[PDB]
Design an enzyme around this catalytic site. Structure first.
Site, mmCIF file in Angstrom:
data_model
loop_
_atom_site.group_PDB
_atom_site.id
_atom_site.type_symbol
_atom_site.label_atom_id
_atom_site.label_comp_id
_atom_site.label_asym_id
_atom_site.label_seq_id
_atom_site.Cartn_x
_atom_site.Cartn_y
_atom_site.Cartn_z
ATOM 1 N N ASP G 43 0.623 -0.872 0.089
ATOM 2 C CA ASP G 43 0.162 0.089 0.240
ATOM 3 C C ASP G 43 0.914 1.229 0.311
ATOM 4 O O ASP G 43 2.159 1.304 0.034
ATOM 5 C CB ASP G 43 -1.099 -0.082 1.511
ATOM 6 C CG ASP G 43 0.063 0.098 2.550
ATOM 7 O OD1 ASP G 43 0.821 0.395 2.644
ATOM 8 O OD2 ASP G 43 -0.695 -0.924 3.646
HETATM 9 C C1 LIG Z 1 10.575 7.289 18.613
HETATM 10 C C2 LIG Z 1 9.052 7.764 18.339
HETATM 11 C C3 LIG Z 1 9.143 9.438 18.536
HETATM 12 C C4 LIG Z 1 7.099 9.165 17.126
HETATM 13 C C5 LIG Z 1 6.166 8.597 17.889
HETATM 14 C C6 LIG Z 1 4.899 8.934 17.411
HETATM 15 C C7 LIG Z 1 3.344 7.802 17.170
HETATM 16 C C8 LIG Z 1 2.198 8.727 16.716
HETATM 17 C C9 LIG Z 1 1.487 7.628 16.658
HETATM 18 C C10 LIG Z 1 -0.015 7.900 16.178
HETATM 19 C C11 LIG Z 1 -0.442 8.026 14.872
HETATM 20 C C12 LIG Z 1 -1.336 7.889 14.153
HETATM 21 O O1 LIG Z 1 -2.135 7.019 14.089
HETATM 22 S S1 LIG Z 1 -1.561 9.067 12.757
HETATM 23 C C13 LIG Z 1 -3.066 8.873 12.192
HETATM 24 C C14 LIG Z 1 -3.527 7.486 11.031
HETATM 25 N N1 LIG Z 1 -4.872 7.021 10.720
HETATM 26 C C15 LIG Z 1 -4.699 6.871 9.889
HETATM 27 O O2 LIG Z 1 -4.093 7.766 8.882
HETATM 28 C C16 LIG Z 1 -6.382 7.008 9.273
HETATM 29 C C17 LIG Z 1 -6.073 6.969 7.445
HETATM 30 N N2 LIG Z 1 -6.121 5.441 7.478
HETATM 31 C C18 LIG Z 1 -5.125 5.738 5.975
HETATM 32 O O3 LIG Z 1 -4.852 6.504 5.800
HETATM 33 C C19 LIG Z 1 -4.375 4.505 6.003
HETATM 34 O O4 LIG Z 1 -5.512 3.399 6.228
HETATM 35 C C20 LIG Z 1 -3.140 4.315 6.150
HETATM 36 C C21 LIG Z 1 -2.504 2.696 6.313
HETATM 37 C C22 LIG Z 1 -3.129 4.343 7.771
HETATM 38 C C23 LIG Z 1 -2.375 4.621 5.252
HETATM 39 O O5 LIG Z 1 -3.396 4.592 3.697
HETATM 40 P P1 LIG Z 1 -3.037 3.167 2.053
HETATM 41 O O6 LIG Z 1 -4.351 2.078 3.402
HETATM 42 O O7 LIG Z 1 -3.109 3.897 1.323
HETATM 43 O O8 LIG Z 1 -1.686 2.873 2.996
#
Ligand SMILES: CCCCCCCCCCCC(=O)SCCNC(=O)CCNC(=O)[C@H](O)C(C)(C)COP(=O)(O)O
Ligand SMILES: C/C=C/C(=O)SCCNC(=O)CCNC(=O)[C@H](O)C(C)(C)COP(=O)(O)OP(=O)(O)OC[C@H]1O[C@@H](n2cnc3c(N)ncnc32)[C@H](O)[C@@H]1OP(=O)(O)O
Ligand SMILES: CCCCCCCCCCCCCCCCCC(=O)O[C@@H](COC(=O)CCCCCCCCCCCCCCC)COP(=O)(O)OCC[N+](C)(C)C
Ligand SMILES: CCCCCCCCCCCCCCCCCC(=O)O[C@@H](COC(=O)CCCCCCCCCCCCCCC)COP(=O)(O)OCC[N+](C)(C)C
Ligand SMILES: CCCCCCCCCCCCCCCCCC(=O)O[C@@H](COC(=O)CCCCCCCCCCCCCCC)COP(=O)(O)OCC[N+](C)(C)C
Ligand SMILES: CCCCCCCCCCCCCCCCCCCC(=O)O[C@H](COC(=O)CCCCCCCCCCCCCC)COP(=O)(O)OCCN
Ligand SMILES: CCCCCCCCCCCCCCCCCCCC(=O)O[C@H](COC(=O)CCCCCCCCCCCCCC)COP(=O)(O)OCCN
Ligand SMILES: CCCCCCCCCCCCCCCCCCCC(=O)O[C@H](COC(=O)CCCCCCCCCCCCCC)COP(=O)(O)OCCN
Ligand SMILES: CCCCCCCCCCCCCCCCCCCC(=O)O[C@H](COC(=O)CCCCCCCCCCCCCC)COP(=O)(O)OCCN
Ligand SMILES: [Fe+3]
Ligand SMILES: [Zn+2]
Lengths: 233, 210, 265, 123, 29, 249, 87
Positions: G43
């Site tokens: 993906d």
């Molecule tokens: C040491 C580390 C330091 C930093 C740590 C940071 C931690 C952050 C934690 C939170 C991060 C999140 O969830 S950030 C929010 C993430 N949530 C989303 O993106 C929901 C929508 N879904 C989508 O876009 C797709 O399911 C997706 C598979 C994601 C991509 O698309 P594809 O399917 O087309 O590949």
């Protein structure tokens, strides 16, 4: 001749010196008005002894450029923005002939392409707006359409017509009573008698319009405009 | 509505200024170049040694640079202009190179003319067009945007088309024509002292008005 | 000032008299052949037949342009160097935001050979290219006329139509909307893309902006011209290293800075 | 008009010293240096002639071997200029003098790396 | 009627003094 | 060479002339007026030969104007030191004549270089088509080059004449050999500039801004001196004989 | 002699290994022309992951407005094989 040019050259030395002296005198009095950028355009311009001879009854717009040995006949008119340059050879304009706005009547600048032909314009000739005449002959009572170009050696015979925007190539002869147009210019049709009448009457109308514009331009320069330009802030 | 201004100048005693600066863009004229008195040079214009610009020509460098090269001539009533950009994507300055003869009544906009070319009278060269070295355009030619005149060729027409290939003698003649036109321009250059005497006329015109 | 000032002024008077005498002697030596330069007699705006041009407040009219007789020019329009608008036997009307480029001729006719003789009507937001000839014809709004094009009497250029550079448009020809015509004689070439319509509009507004800087420069007085000459000379070059040694920062004066709407970016 | 500037245009990509890729334009028959000077990627004032006798490697560019095979081999004078102009006096095998590379239709799509400009303006 | 730039007037006097003094210097030597 | 090229050009012009005058004054009054003798004249002998050879070859290698002039000056100080080496009144006189003439030629050359620096002249090839864009400037610069080469009857011929005058008399045939070779090499790299300004037809020309009044006047006077000095060389000849004698009396 | 570009063959092998051992790529669809999305079951998040992996292995950062075009192994190798910052 050569002596005349020597005296003309020496004369420039004396004049240059006198004008410099005048600027020095003005500088001692704290005046800088000689620094003003004023137009050096001359409606009639001489190149040594080659000077324009203009009939008293001919209209020449102030913005027109007449350079060198150029003859303009009575009742003729040189309109706004026109350029006439006879230096390598002569240019002659007959009586009752209109040279329309932004037209160019000039001769070959160099004899590299052969002997420089003069430009001969006959009587009661109409030369349209922005036409180019280059070392050609234009006989009496002919019509040159505006934006047309006539190259050197061309002859436009009497009552000939050159259509607007035409390109008459070098040494082409336009026979009488014929309309030639296009690039290159080619025979299109014969001239009708109504067109001859319009040629003559349009020329006479232009001579009257010339009169009106010459009277307009000859009026005294307005002093209010001068004071407005002087007192600007 | 057309609402006029009472203060607009109807007659300007100074005439049209030959050199029109535009901010810091100041036209540059070589000391041994002839520029006719009624020519207008505006903005980014450079006129180089031995070149000449004749009566009624207008060179307006307000969108790009305009250059007239060594011993080149822009003849009567020519208009030379330029644009911000060209359709070809090459830079859009107007470049007139050395030993170039631009025939009277010619219109140039964002074109390049390579050294030793002759442009016929009443020609038109459009945006991004290119005239290669040692080429000749006949009078009345129209070169559309981005069109090219290949080197060593004679072209003409509206629009311009190949006519014939030039001989070596013909191509040898081109710088000679440029040099001859420079020689003629010398005679006009010798008619003008460094200063005019118009300021005296302005002085007495002022005095007669108090 | 004072006695020394007066004495130096008198000596300057003597020097001026001597210089003008030398100039006269030099003129005599040249055989009086040199035609003398004189005060400019060109009138940018002129009456004829008791017709005065009607020009809006914010119109750039280049000083070298000729606007004569019964001519009307609308708001934001611009008449460029060497243009001639001769409204002497008939009327010339120019709309708003319309540019008439350098060395263009616009004229009219009192009576045409055949048909109804019409004035010269140029609409709003029209571009007319360098060295065009407009004669007794009608150009409607948002039309484009190429450089060096010729329009003869009775020609109608319709809205959003183009006349190519160098074209000769014969009398009474009609250029329909959305088409480009060209050649000698002018004839249909092709339809106008939407991007070209946007180009025409862009042309018009770019000219509106260019007219402002040209009008500002051409209307400056002698004193301001001298001030700006000195300022231009002072700021033509720089020594930023010596300025940093002095701890100062030289700034370009605002009278030398062009507006952003005319800059290439 | 049966002969266009588009007939001679050569599509090119240049990577600036900061690493960013730019699509640039040049004419066939002219030098790579001229194409690079069109957009100011190389200062035109620093290299005003296309002659090896007026060159201190201000025109120097780095080209990968896939495009190097499509160019004529470096002459002895070119390598001399490149080596002496090197800070370490070492000849880079991917270095070419831009003033000595003439653009052709066969170089469509060539990728060129422009190194950081050397001082050029002798007091 | 009067030149008002005092420094310019002083410079004019200095130039005149230089010219006249040079003439006298040549004449008396 | 490095200092001459890297310094601002007016600095380079000043360093090329005045310190030589001052330090040769010092050298004359220290060594000539003092006494260890043949050892030191041999020092200047060997350094003169080395300077002539290396200056000629290195100048032949140069593609830039300033570096060429620097190496040219090194070669000419070799020519001048030949006069100090032979330890005679005529040797001192010839050294002084060589300094005067080299100084006026260097002033001419750097006036041209400074005039051309307004358009950022850097390479010899930048002079292409100069005989077309400024004919009188190309001729003036050509006279300087031919004078540097020592072609008679230009002023530069004086140094070549004394170089061979000192060798033939003192018996130094190796020095004469070296002078012939290095003079021919020098003539080649001096006339290369003339070839660039007059014979070449480059595709791109550089148009140079005209010089100011100061440099034009200085150039005009130094160019008359270089062309016409050997018509009336008596004052320099007398003044330098006077100076050579005044060191001991 | 010293050069400025990594060899094409070396970059090909490096990118091939990086894609082969990534997480969800069986080392049997990995061809020098294979596309990330259509042919590798990856993906957009995983393709961004792989491109970021390309950055670590060659020690330099690929512009965001340039990574959008690296969609297969051939486009990748075309990019890194000519980038001077590659190591
Ligand atoms: C040491 C580390 C330091 C930093 C740590 C940071 C931690 C952050 C934690 C939170 C991060 C999140 O969830 S950030 C929010 C993430 N949530 C989303 O993106 C929901 C929508 N879904 C989508 O876009 C797709 O399911 C997706 C598979 C994601 C991509 O698309 P594809 O399917 O087309 O590949
Ligand atoms: C920022 C400033 C903005 C301004 O104010 S711009 C004002 C100054 N510039 C101008 O006036 C130029 C405007 N552009 C044009 O006129 C231009 O030509 C034009 C816009 C019609 C045409 O330019 P194109 O690039 O679009 O030309 P085409 O692709 O349509 O070519 C068609 C065809 O017409 C021919 N050709 C095209 N151009 C012209 C012409 N004109 N005439 C005759 N014949 C032509 C050409 O040979 C071509 O091949 P053939 O037909 O097979 O022979
Ligand atoms: C009726 C018969 C008498 C005719 C007399 C003719 C004699 C004229 C002889 C020519 C003299 C040439 C002198 C050349 C020097 C130019 C002097 C000058 O230019 O005046 C300047 C500067 O003057 C000076 O600084 C010193 C020189 C002045 C001294 C010579 C003046 C010559 C006329 C004498 C006038 C004074 C006589 C009375 C004194 C009480 C005025 O000041 P600024 O305008 O600020 O200068 C601007 C810069 N620029 C030089 C380029 C113009
Ligand atoms: C015999 C010596 C040994 C060999 C060395 C020879 C060196 C020269 C090489 C010879 C080959 C040919 C050389 C051709 C040069 C001739 C052309 C020339 O120099 O003409 C100059 C002329 O150069 C000069 O100015 C020379 C001036 C020197 C003055 C020497 C004379 C001294 C007394 C004369 C008094 C004044 C004149 C008296 C009569 C009026 C013109 O220069 P331009 O750059 O073309 O234009 C100048 C600009 N403008 C014309 C507008 C002024
Ligand atoms: C460029 C290279 C080509 C060749 C060079 C040509 C020109 C070079 C210039 C050389 C000039 C050398 C000047 C030597 C100084 C002589 C001064 C002197 O002896 O005193 C003169 C003073 O001379 C002058 O006043 C004029 C000086 C020269 C002026 C030349 C102007 C040039 C200006 C240069 C910058 C521009 C006599 O005046 P008195 O005080 O009456 O005599 C004093 C002696 N006694 C104690 C016994 C009474
Ligand atoms: C540089 C370009 C050269 C300049 C052009 C030629 C100069 C000609 C001007 C002089 C004309 C009139 C001179 C007047 C005069 O005799 O008075 C004397 C002034 O001498 C003077 O004015 C002396 C001028 C000396 C010129 C420079 C000589 C350079 C020598 C070359 C050596 C260089 C090598 C240095 C390591 C002092 O009266 P006086 O006769 O009582 O004084 C010496 C007693 N002993
Ligand atoms: C080719 C054939 C000739 C090759 C060179 C011959 C070397 C021997 C000459 C010799 O005996 O030199 C003596 C010393 O000259 C000298 O001056 C010594 C030789 C020259 C030393 C300086 C030049 C070195 C090279 C410089 C460029 C290279 C730099 C390093 C790479 C000459 O005897 P004499 O002339 O004193 O006799 C005066 C009598 N009255
Ligand atoms: C021996 C061979 C034959 C030689 C021939 C001898 C003949 C004598 C020479 C006659 C001269 C003819 C011309 C005389 C009239 C010109 C007057 C100069 C006008 C003037 O005031 O010039 C100012 C500049 O100074 C200048 O331009 C003057 C400085 C010029 C440099 C020369 C003097 C420098 C010091 C001595 C050098 C000695 C070197 C030798 C080792 C202002 O000029 P502008 O108003 O045009 O504005 C320039 C923009 N800033
Ligand atoms: C340190 C010393 C350095 C001084 C440098 C010397 C000047 C450099 C020469 C370059 C230009 C001079 C032109 C050469 C003169 C050509 C004709 C020679 C001649 O017989 O003229 C005599 C000298 O004129 C002159 O006086 C020549 C004009 C001066 C410039 C006048 O003859 P005469 O009988 O008056 O003099 C008694 C000797 N014949
Ligand atoms: Fe190079
Ligand atoms: Zn009309």
């Amino acid at each position: 001749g050569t002596l005349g040019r020597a005296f003309y050259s020496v004369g420039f030395w004396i004049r240059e010196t006198g004008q410099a002296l005048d600027r020095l005198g003005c500088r001692l009095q704290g005046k800088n008005y000689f620094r003003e950028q004023l137009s050096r355009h001359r409606t009639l311009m001489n190149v040594f002894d080659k000077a324009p001879i203009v009939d008293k009854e001919a209209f020449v717009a102030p913005s027109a450029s007449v350079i060198g040995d150029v003859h303009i006949g009575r009742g003729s008119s040189i309109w706004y923005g026109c350029v006439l340059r006879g230096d390598v050879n002569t240019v002659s304009v007959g009586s009752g002939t209109n040279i329309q706005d932004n037209s160019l009547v000039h001769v070959a600048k160099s004899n590299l392409s052969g002997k420089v032909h003069p430009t001969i314009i006959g009587d009661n000739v109409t030369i349209g707006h922005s036409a180019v005449l280059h070392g050609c002959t234009v006989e009496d009572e002919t019509f040159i359409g505006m934006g047309a170009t006539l190259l050197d050696g061309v002859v436009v015979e009497k009552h000939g017509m050159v259509a607007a925007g035409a390109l008459v190539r070098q040494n082409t002869r336009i026979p009488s009573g014929e309309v030639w147009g296009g690039n290159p210019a080619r025979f299109l049709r014969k001239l009708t008698d109504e067109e001859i009448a319009f040629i003559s009457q349009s020329a006479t109308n232009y001579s009257n319009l010339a009169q009106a514009h010459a009277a307009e331009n000859a009026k005294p320069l307005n002093v209010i405009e001068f004071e407005k330009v002087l007192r600007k802030k | 509505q057309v609402t006029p201004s009472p203060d607009r100048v109807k007659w300007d005693y100074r005439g049209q200024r030959q050199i029109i600066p535009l901010g810091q863009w100041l036209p540059k004229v070589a000391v041994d170049a002839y520029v006719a008195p009624n020519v207008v040079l505006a903005g980014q214009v450079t006129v180089w040694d031995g070149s000449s610009v004749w009566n009624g020509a207008v060179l307006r460098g307000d969108l790009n640079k305009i250059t007239v090269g060594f011993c080149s001539n822009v003849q009567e009533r020519c208009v030379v202009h330029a644009a911000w950009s060209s359709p070809t994507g090459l830079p859009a300055q107007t470049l007139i190179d050395r030993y170039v003869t631009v025939g009277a009544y010619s219109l140039l906009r964002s074109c390049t003319i390579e050294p030793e070319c002759i442009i016929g009278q009443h020609s038109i060269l459009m945006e991004g067009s290119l005239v290669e070295t040692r080429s000749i355009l006949e009078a009345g030619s129209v070169l559309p945007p981005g069109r090219r005149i290949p080197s060593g060729e004679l072209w003409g027409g509206n629009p311009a088309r190949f006519i014939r290939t030039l001989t070596n003698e013909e191509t040898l003649e081109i710088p000679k024509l440029a040099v001859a036109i420079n020689h003629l321009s010398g005679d006009y250059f010798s008619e003008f002292l460094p200063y005019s005497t118009i300021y005296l006329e302005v002085e007495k015109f002022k005095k007669s008005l108090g | 000032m004072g006695t020394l000032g007066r004495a130096i002024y008198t000596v300057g008077n003597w020097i001026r008299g001597t210089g003008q005498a030398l100039d006269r002697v030099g003129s005599l030596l040249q055989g009086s052949h040199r035609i003398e330069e004189h005060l400019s007699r060109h009138r940018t705006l002129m009456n004829v037949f008791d017709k005065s041009p009607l020009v809006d407040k914010d119109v750039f009219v280049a000083p070298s342009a000729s606007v004569i007789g019964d001519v009307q020019i609308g708001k934001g329009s611009s008449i460029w160097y060497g243009c001639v608008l001769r409204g002497d036997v008939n009327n010339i009307s120019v709309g708003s935001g319309t540019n008439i480029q350098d060395n263009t001729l616009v004229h009219v006719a009192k009576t045409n050979i055949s048909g109804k003789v019409l004035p010269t009507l140029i609409g709003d937001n029209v571009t007319v290219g360098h060295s065009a000839v407009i004669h007794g014809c009608t150009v409607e709004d948002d039309a484009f006329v190429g450089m060096g094009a010729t329009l003869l009497d009775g020609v109608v250029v319709e809205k959003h139509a183009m006349v190519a550079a160098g074209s000769l448009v014969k009398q009474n020809t009609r250029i329909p909307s959305g088409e480009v015509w060209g050649g000698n004689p002018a004839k249909f070439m092709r339809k106008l893309t939407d991007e070209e319509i946007v180009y025409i509009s862009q042309s018009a507004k770019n000219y509106i902006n260019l007219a402002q800087i040209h009008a500002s420069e051409n209307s400056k007085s002698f004193e301001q011209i001298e001030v700006e000459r000195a300022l231009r000379k002072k700021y033509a070059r720089k020594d930023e290293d010596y300025d940093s040694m002095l701890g100062i920062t030289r700034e370009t004066p605002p009278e030398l800075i062009l507006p952003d709407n005319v800059l290439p970016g | 008009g049966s002969k266009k500037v588009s007939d001679r245009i050569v599509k090119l990509s240049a990577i600036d010293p900061d690493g960013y890729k730019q699509d640039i334009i040049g004419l066939s028959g002219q030098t790579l240096l001229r194409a690079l000077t069109h957009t100011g990627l190389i200062d035109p004032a620093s290299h005003r002639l296309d002659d090896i006798e007026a060159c201190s490697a201000e025109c120097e560019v780095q080209i990968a071997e896939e495009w190097l095979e499509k160019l004529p081999p470096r002459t002895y004078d070119e390598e001399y200029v490149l080596k002496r102009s090197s800070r370490s006096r070492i000849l880079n095998k991917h270095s070419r003098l831009g003033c000595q590379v003439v653009l052709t239709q066969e170089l469509q799509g060539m990728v060129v790396a422009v190194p950081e400009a050397k001082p050029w303006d002798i007091p | 009627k009067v030149s008002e730039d005092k420094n310019r007037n002083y410079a004019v006097v200095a130039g005149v003094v230089a010219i006249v003094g040079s003439i006298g210097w040549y004449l008396k030597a | 060479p490095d200092i001459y090229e890297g310094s601002p050009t007016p600095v380079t012009a000043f360093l090329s002339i005045a310190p030589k005058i001052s330090i040769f004054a010092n050298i004359l009054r220290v060594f000539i007026y003092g006494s260890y003798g043949a050892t030191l004249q041999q020092i200047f002998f060997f350094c003169s030969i080395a300077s002539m050879i290396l200056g000629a070859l290195a100048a032949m290698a140069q593609t830039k104007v300033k570096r060429l002039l620097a190496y040219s000056s090194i070669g000419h100080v070799g020519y001048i030191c030949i006069g100090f080496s032979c330890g005679t009144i005529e040797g001192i006189q010839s050294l002084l004549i060589g300094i005067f003439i080299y100084a006026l030629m260097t002033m001419d050359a750097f006036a041209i270089v400074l005039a051309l620096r307004q358009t950022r002249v850097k390479y010899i090839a930048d002079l292409g088509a100069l005989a077309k864009t400024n004919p009188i400037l190309a001729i003036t610069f050509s006279i300087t080059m031919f004078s540097y080469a020592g072609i008679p009857p230009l002023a530069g011929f004086c140094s070549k004449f004394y170089l061979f005058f000192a060798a033939l008399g003192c018996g130094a045939y190796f020095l004469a050999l070296v002078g012939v070779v290095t003079s021919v090499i020098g003539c080649f790299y001096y006339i290369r500039l003339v070839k660039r300004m007059f014979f070449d037809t480059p595709r791109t020309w550089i148009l140079y801004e005209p010089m100011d009044r100061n440099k034009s006047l200085l150039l005009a006077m130094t160019s008359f001196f270089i062309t016409l000095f050997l018509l009336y060389p008596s004052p320099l000849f007398s003044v330098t004989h006077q100076m050579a004698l005044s060191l001991y009396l | 002699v010293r050069g400025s570009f990594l060899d094409k063959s070396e970059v090909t092998d490096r990118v091939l290994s990086v894609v082969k051992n990534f997480q969800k790529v069986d080392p049997s669809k990995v061809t020098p022309k294979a596309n990330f999305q259509n042919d590798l079951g990856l993906d957009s998040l995983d393709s961004v992951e792989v491109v970021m992996a390309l950055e670590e292995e060659f020690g330099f950062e690929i512009p965001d407005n340039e990574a959008d075009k690296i969609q297969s192994i051939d486009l990748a190798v075309d990019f890194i094989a000519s980038h001077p910052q590659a190591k």
